[PDB]
């Protein structure tokens, strides 16, 4: 896919953005969300218990039974919340690796520049082998950017696949 792009494009694209601060901020947000909802979970169970021992009756036990699927759902929700920060960190890490491993624009430009210079002076054919060397290096740049972008896509797709779709809560009434 990205192997159809020249390294000039693949390298430029990975260097252009604002960086991962936006994602890391989101990660800190999901963690706090996880903390808050865990406390919400505790408070919901303390309420049910506090209602049971205060006024134990047929009406209350019915309500206690009706809420059992919801406390179950709440547990699943909290588990799912604690998962998000970890997967965002995996995505950020993947990006950081892609950024680090991509062929720097300076190296690509210098290759193309050096190749043109040799070509400009190759009427006698003494630089043909070296020009071949530079074309090989550029082809390597091309394939390397392709591989880096391939691994990036794979790592991000893996991380996103661990983010289960949210399920709607069951009624208590």
């Amino acid at each position: 896919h990205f192997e159809a792009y020249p390294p000039e494009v693949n390298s430029a694209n990975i260097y252009a953005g604002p960086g991962p601060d936006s994602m890391l901020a989101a990660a800190r947000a999901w963690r706090s969300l996880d903390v808050e909802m865990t406390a919400v979970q505790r408070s919901f169970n303390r309420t049910l218990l506090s209602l049971m021992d205060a006024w134990a009756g047929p009406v209350v036990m019915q309500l206690m039974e009706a809420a059992k699927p919801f406390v179950r759902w709440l547990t699943d929700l909290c588990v799912q919340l604690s998962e998000v920060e970890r997967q965002i960190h995996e995505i950020v890490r993947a990006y950081e690796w892609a950024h680090h491993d991509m062929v720097p624009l300076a190296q690509i430009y210098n290759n193309r520049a050096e190749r043109q210079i040799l070509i400009d002076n190759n009427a006698l054919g003494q630089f043909t082998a070296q020009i071949a060397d530079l074309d090989q290096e550029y082809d390597d740049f091309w394939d390397e950017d392709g591989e880096v972008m391939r691994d990036y896509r794979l790592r991000v797709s893996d991380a996103l696949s661990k983010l289960t779709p949210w399920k709607a809560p069951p009624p208590i009434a």
Partner: protein, 82 residues
């Protein structure tokens, strides 16, 4: 009877806290930007934003469930006292 009215209030408090925490971090979770200009970064950002939006809808639904439950606690207290 009194305990049911008390329970209804504690439930509503829980609903509020869930809604408040959701609203508090929504500007961060729904505003994820692509870290780079490439297609992979954009797809990751887009996913994380949509995921946050879907979570907010999930919490709003939970808020409804909690409020219905508090209403049943309130109706239960008044209905089973007359």
């Amino acid at each position: 009877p009194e305990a049911l009215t008390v329970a209804a209030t504690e439930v509503r408090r829980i609903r509020d806290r869930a809604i408040q925490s959701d609203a508090q971090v929504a500007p961060m979770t729904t505003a994820v930007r692509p870290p780079a200009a490439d297609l992979v970064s954009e797809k990751a950002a887009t996913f994380l934003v949509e995921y946050a939006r879907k979570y907010r809808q999930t919490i709003a639904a939970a808020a409804v469930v909690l409020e219905e439950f508090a209403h049943a606690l309130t109706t239960g207290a008044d209905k089973y006292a007359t």
